[PDB]
Amino acid sequence: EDKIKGMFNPKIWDKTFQDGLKKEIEDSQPYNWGTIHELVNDDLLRAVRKEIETEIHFTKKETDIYRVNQSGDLANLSGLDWDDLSRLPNLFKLRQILYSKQYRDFFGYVTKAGKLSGSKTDMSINTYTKGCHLLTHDDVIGSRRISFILYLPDPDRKWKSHYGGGLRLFPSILPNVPHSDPSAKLVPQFNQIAFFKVLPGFSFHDVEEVKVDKHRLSIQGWYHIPQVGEEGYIPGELEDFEFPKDERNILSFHEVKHFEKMLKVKLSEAEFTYLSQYISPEHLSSKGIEKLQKQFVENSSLQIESFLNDDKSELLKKVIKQKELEQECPYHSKDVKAPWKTAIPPHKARYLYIDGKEYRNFQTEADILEALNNNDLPNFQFTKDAIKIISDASGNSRENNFDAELALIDLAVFHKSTIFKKYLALLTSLCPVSEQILIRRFRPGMDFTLATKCRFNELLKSNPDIIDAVLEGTLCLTPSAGWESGELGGYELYMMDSVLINDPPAWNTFNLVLRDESVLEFVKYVSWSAKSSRWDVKMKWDVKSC
Numbered sequence: 001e002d003k004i005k006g007m008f009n010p011k012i013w014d015k016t017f018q019d020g021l022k023k024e025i026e027d028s029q030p031y032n033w034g035t036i037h038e039l040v041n042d043d044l045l046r047a048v049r050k051e052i053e054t055e056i057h058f059t060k061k062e063t064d065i066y067r068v069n070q071s072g073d074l075a076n077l078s079g080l081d082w083d084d085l086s087r088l089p090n091l092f093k094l095r096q097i098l099y100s101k102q103y104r105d106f107f108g109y110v111t112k113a114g115k116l117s118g119s120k121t122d123m124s125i126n127t128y129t130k131g132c133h134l135l136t137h138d139d140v141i142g143s144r145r146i147s148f149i150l151y152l153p154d155p156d157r158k159w160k161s162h163y164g165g166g167l168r169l170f171p172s173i174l175p176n177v178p179h180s181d182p183s184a185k186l187v188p189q190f191n192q193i194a195f196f197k198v199l200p201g202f203s204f205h206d207v208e209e210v211k212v213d214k215h216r217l218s219i220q221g222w223y224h225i226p227q228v229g230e231e232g233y234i235p236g237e238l239e240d241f242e243f244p245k246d247e248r249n250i251l252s253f254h255e256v257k258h259f260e261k262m263l264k265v266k267l268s269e270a271e272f273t274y275l276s277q278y279i280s281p282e283h284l285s286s287k288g289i290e291k292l293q294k295q296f297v298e299n300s301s302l303q304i305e306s307f308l309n310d311d312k313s314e315l316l317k318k319v320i321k322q323k324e325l326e327q328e329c330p331y332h333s334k335d336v337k338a339p340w341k342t343a344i345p346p347h348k349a350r351y352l353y354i355d356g357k358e359y360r361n362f363q364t365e366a367d368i369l370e371a372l373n374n375n376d377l378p379n380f381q382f383t384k385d386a387i388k389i390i391s392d393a394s395g396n397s398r399e400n401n402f403d404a405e406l407a408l409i410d411l412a413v414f415h416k417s418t419i420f421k422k423y424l425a426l427l428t429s430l431c432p433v434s435e436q437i438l439i440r441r442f443r444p445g446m447d448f449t450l451a452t453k454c455r456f457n458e459l460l461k462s463n464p465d466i467i468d469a470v471l472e473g474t475l476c477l478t479p480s481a482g483w484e485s486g487e488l489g490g491y492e493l494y495m496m497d498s499v500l501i502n503d504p505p506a507w508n509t510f511n512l513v514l515r516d517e518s519v520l521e522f523v524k525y526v527s528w529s530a531k532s533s534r535w536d537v538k539m540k541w542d543v544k545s546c
């Protein structure tokens with residue numbers, strides 16, 4: 001058609017504009033990308049927005065990595081059928097011009113992408129409303145070659161930075177290892193397009209949570225590698241960088257023999273006394289133990305309420321609330337200080353944790369390689385010792401004290417005790433043979449994990465006595481309200497590869513799950529709107545049957 005070029009801003013046909021844009025994309029950071037303002041005929045795009053509002057039904061969908069209002073799921077009668085746009089003539093026209101030979105020649109030229117398919121049209125229409133988000137990903141799927149997003153928020157009002165919903169780009173520490181924190185954030189406006197060549201290991205981006213009751217509407221899509229022969233196209237013409245590691249340390253022979261001897265309520269008065277320092281009387285009585293045992297036999301899981309006793313519940317709630325209220329939480333990995341670490345990389349997870357290992361702050365490749373050449377083991381008492389020194393020098397003020405960290409480490413030490421593992425073996429009739437304990441904090445608007453399976457200990461795979469499962473515990477210490485609906489996120493989700501557990505954050509609960517090879521788990525992204533972080537203690541053990 002003669003009219004296709006005239007449906008765009010005439011600047012994109014100007015050689016001088018094209019060459020300048022090609023150079024800007026070439027020299028962009030943190031990987032090659034670009035943006036064009038006022039792309040399309042304003043009346044056309046306005047007409048498209050009206051059609052969308054009028055004709056398209058959006059359906060909220062939530063997974064580990066996103067919450068979005070989609071229109072594309074053809075498992076909904078509601079699902080948008082791109083083969084039938086009878087009532088969206090202007091949308092039909094928009095797709096036609098974006099995949100035109102004319103536009104593709106311009107666009108492939110400035111992005112240095114090579115040939116682009118005109119027939120492989122690939123678009124979807126979505127809105128992000130309050131709490132909606134999409135976490136870090138690189139778009140690498142199939143024949144996708146260039147990613148684009150055309151923004152259609154209200155054309156007569158400015159989208160503002162504090163609304164959220166920014167497009168964020170993440171720089172590379174090394175290939176397939178994006179930095180945890182983004183280095184650029186685009187605030188989208190009507191008739192702006194953002195785009196980038198899809199680059200395995202590099203083109204990491206996300207959609208910042210929408211923080212207000214506004215509708216962030218977009219059309220997002222891809223240009224693909226052409227079909228074979230299309231316009232003459234001829235084909236052909238990392239676990240190491242994850243922290244913390246999903247690894248456990250084997251227990252001493254002293255411990256393991258204790259558990260065996262017991263399994264072949266046999267705890268002593270002194271052991272019950274020790275347990276009663278932390279655990280509520282309810283769960284140490286003969287009746288309570290029997291109930292928990294029966295529950296674990298039937299479900300291969302426990303969900304305990306009011307796990308810790310009142311003394312320790314009161315202490316931990318106090319110091320955690322004080323820290324929430326009176327201290328400045330770091331919101332960039334560079335600002336995080338001992339004893340905390342940031343989980344990396346961000347296309348897998350982001351949260352703060354205490355593991356008892358020497359301090360690490362991963363800003364460069366050198367930082368990571370140094371850790372990989374010098375593996376060290378957890379030691380929580382040394383971590384405590386280190387905190388005291390830091391703490392004395394500064395002065396232990398309301399603003400800088402480590403009261404929460406010290407109380408939490410004391411709790412970790414309890415769960416590390418031989419006697420606690422004996423109680424665990426009693427509840428489960430399983431013998432722990434390894435352990436990993438982590439204290440975790442999931443900050444509002446930053447932190448999450450994605451759905452993953454347990455990681456078997458490879459060295460133990462051939463041991464017949466060791467169960468093909470990982471026993472996993474979670475002690476939640478989240479003192480704030482408003483979580484019950486799941487709307488603020490932070491819920492612990494266990495599901496089969498159908499949901500086994502879906503528990504929003506709560507105060508003083510203990511979940512215990514025997515995971516076989518296929519069970520998936522994650523902690524959902526915590527909304528910016530949450531009233532505190534999710535705080536918990538995570539425990540994992542290899543087990544043998546005795």
Ligand SMILES: O=C(O)CNC(=O)c1nc(Cl)c2ccccc2c1O
Nearest residue numbers: 124126139149167205206207218220
């Ligand atoms: O909207 C934006 O600024 C960035 N959006 C995305 O990167 C994005 N990426 C993918 Cl892979 C999908 C995929 C499906 C639906 C929406 C998506 C999306 O908004």
Ligand SMILES: [Mn+2]
Nearest residue numbers: 137138139205
């Ligand atoms: Mn994307």
